[PDB]
Amino acid sequence: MNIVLMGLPGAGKGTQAERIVEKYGIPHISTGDMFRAAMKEETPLGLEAKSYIDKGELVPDEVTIGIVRERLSKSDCERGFLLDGFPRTVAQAEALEEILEEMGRPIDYVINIQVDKEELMERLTGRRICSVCGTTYHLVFNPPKTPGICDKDGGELYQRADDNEETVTKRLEVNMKQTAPLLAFYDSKEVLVNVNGQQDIQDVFADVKVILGGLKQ
Numbered sequence: 569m570n571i572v573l574m575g576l577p578g579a580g581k582g583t584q585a586e587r588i589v590e591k592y593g594i595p596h597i598s599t600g601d602m603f604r605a606a607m608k609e610e611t612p613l614g615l616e617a618k619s620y621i622d623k624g625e626l627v628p629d630e631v632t633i634g635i636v637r638e639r640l641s642k643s644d645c646e647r648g649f650l651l652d653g654f655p656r657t658v659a660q661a662e663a664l665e666e667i668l669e670e671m672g673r674p675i676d677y678v679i680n681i682q683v684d685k686e687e688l689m690e691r692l693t694g695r696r697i698c699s700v701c702g703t704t705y706h707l708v709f710n711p712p713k714t715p716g717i718c719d720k721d722g723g724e725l726y727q728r729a730d731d732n733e734e735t736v737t738k739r740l741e742v743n744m745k746q747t748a749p750l751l752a753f754y755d756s757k758e759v760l761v762n763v764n765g766q767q768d769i770q771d772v773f774a775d776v777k778v779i780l781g782g783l784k785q
């Protein structure tokens with residue numbers, strides 16, 4: 569159960585990741601989360617990352633590969649893991665292959681969550697996130713039970729700093745450039761599976777379960 573999720577900004581990676589972790593019991597590894605946590609702490613790594621993240625640009629490959637290698641070296645990853653939003657360049661994918669070869673933990677599937685690009689702006693601009701647990705809601709498509717607060721813990725919802733229209737436009741341009749080469753990389757390795765992310769959340773997850781329920785040790 570060594571799984572990677574890829575998809576354009578807003579496609580539903582984090583929404584699916586939360587459900588995969590709950591169902592299958594493997595740790596969530598999100599480069600986005602790691603960077604934003606480091607930003608909040610204002611560490612040298614965080615202060616370096618912030619410059620890129622704020623513009624909607626990719627953080628350099630070197631630092632990014634480093635933090636993922638470090639995370640994967642932790643004991644919990646022995647049972648599997650769910651990488652969310654990494655790799656997102658071919659150089660990251662190549663380094664990952666080598667790391668996982670050394671570790672003896674090769675990827676089972678790369679799940680590509682496909683959503684029409686024309687949908688992604690509204691996905692992001694309408695997104696609200698729990699400040700306590702980080703789960704995501706959508707004011708139109710997936711609202712909380714009580715406006716402004718999280719169903720699970722009562723935490724206050726907020727809007728991610730990079731979810732403004734101008735930053736979203738950039739984030740979409742940057743990552744769309746990467747789509748064809750990464751798809752070509754993993755289609756080659758015969759681990760790529762496409763899922764239709766343009767469905768109700770539980771229906772996208774139904775399709776994810778078809779794939780992940782098939783895995784046997």
Ligand SMILES: Nc1ncnc2c1ncn2[C@@H]1O[C@H](COP(=O)(O)OP(=O)(O)OP(=O)(O)OP(=O)(O)OP(=O)(O)OC[C@H]2O[C@@H](n3cnc4c(N)ncnc43)[C@H](O)[C@@H]2O)[C@@H](O)[C@H]1O
Pocket residue numbers: 575576577578579580581582583584599600601603620621622624625626627628632652653654655656660691692694695696704705706707709710739765766767768769772
């Ligand atoms: N490897 C790397 N290398 C270099 N730099 C890196 C890097 N990784 C990260 N970075 C940097 O860090 C930044 C942030 O990265 P990261 O945090 O990875 O952001 P991202 O990839 O842009 O993805 P998002 O979290 O924005 O969206 P998602 O697809 O997870 O959507 P969600 O499930 O919340 O859903 C979106 C919204 O839609 C709603 N929703 C979800 N599913 C559905 C559905 N099926 N139907 C309707 N609505 C839905 C949700 O409720 C929510 O409101 C990057 O821009 C970059 O600067």
Ligand SMILES: [Mg+2]
Pocket residue numbers: 581582583600
């Ligand atoms: Mg996410």
Ligand SMILES: [Zn+2]
Pocket residue numbers: 698699700701702703718719720721722723
């Ligand atoms: Zn919460």
